[PDB]
């Protein structure tokens, strides 16, 4: 009976899910445009633990001897201390991380952090670190503009919809919202330098892989 009720529902080229009549059932398949065989359970960190922990983890205050990036994690570490213009970039990144946390805590009122999403970021990073034999001893040659502006640019490339009008572009921003929250928390500046230790080379490799895998995760029109 279930088969009979859904048999005619297919994904069209507009990413819409419709029945034989042409009626819209889902304005975008699965509310995210993704193919289920390309989704994996991942942990949305931004959502868990105490705020102190949230701040210790993501907060970068170039204007504070204590809450700055130690000059050993970064090559240009010393000359970054007290940099007003960069600190403006780093505050944009933090306000966004704090919004994300609020947002997530509303969607998953529970507090649950592991949810199936496409592109396994942790795996991509474990690859980079092995591929470029990244030594956890020397400071990275990544710029703060490299990371912040880099992660910001990538987000404009994770495409599910392409329409050039206003409606579609909003639909596009919506569909990619949850994934982008995972993204921003995985590629926050302190994380990239303190935890992962990516070099400019490994990092640029990580960004293009995430885009490749993501696009490879979108559902194909014609899916029954």
């Amino acid at each position: 009976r279930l088969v009979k009720a859904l048999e005619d529902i297919m994904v069209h080229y507009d990413n819409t899910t419709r029945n034989s009549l042409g009626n819209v059932i889902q304005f975008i398949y699965g509310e995210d445009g993704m193919d289920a065989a390309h989704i994996e359970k991942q942990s949305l960190d931004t959502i868990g633990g105490s705020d102190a922990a949230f701040e210790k983890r993501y907060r970068v205050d170039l204007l504070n001897t204590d809450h700055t990036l130690d000059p050993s994690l970064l090559e240009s570490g010393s000359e970054i201390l007290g940099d007003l213009k960069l600190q403006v970039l780093l505050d944009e990144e933090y306000k966004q991380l704090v919004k994300d946390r609020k947002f997530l805590r509303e969607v998953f009122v529970d507090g649950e952090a592991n949810w199936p999403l496409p592109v396994n970021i942790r795996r991509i990073i474990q690859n980079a670190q092995q591929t470029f034999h990244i030594d956890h001893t020397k400071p990275s040659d990544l710029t703060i503009k490299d990371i912040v502006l880099g992660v910001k640019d990538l987000q404009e490339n994770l495409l599910v919809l392409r329409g050039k009008n206003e409606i579609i572009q909003n639909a596009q921003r919506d569909a990619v919202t949850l994934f982008c929250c995972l993204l921003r928390s995985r590629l926050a500046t302190r994380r990239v330098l303190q935890e992962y230790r990516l070099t400019k080379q490994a990092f640029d490799w990580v960004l293009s892989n995430i885009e490749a895998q993501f696009l490879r995760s979108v559902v194909h029109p014609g899916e029954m």
């Binding site: 069209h12 080229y13 507009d14 819409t16 419709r18 042409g22 919809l161 392409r162 329409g163 050039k164 579609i168 490749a212 696009l215 490879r216 979108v218 194909h220 029109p221 014609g222």
Partner: protein
């Protein structure tokens, strides 16, 4: 009702269904002694040759993608990016 080469909002990427049908159409032709467009570095199995033609973007085929409303877009096998 056709859409200009510009303004196509459909995927730049080839779908697994298109790849399956193109390879099958092309293979059928090769199975009937139709002219091949690549160098058979030893191949003899049609589908296997078709796959070779695809990789070298030498399949003169076009895909007509219809939209639920009736309009449609045209993408050449050449254009389509193949990553699956």
């Amino acid at each position: 009702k056709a859409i200009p080469k510009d303004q196509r909002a459909t995927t730049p990427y080839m779908t697994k269904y298109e790849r399956a049908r193109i390879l099958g159409t092309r293979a059928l032709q090769i199975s009937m002694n139709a002219p091949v467009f690549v160098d058979l570095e030893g191949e003899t199995d049609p589908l296997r040759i078709a796959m070779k033609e695809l990789a070298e973007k030498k399949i003169p085929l076009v895909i007509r993608r219809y939209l639920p409303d009736g309009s449609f877009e045209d993408w050449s096998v050449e254009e389509l990016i193949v990553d699956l």
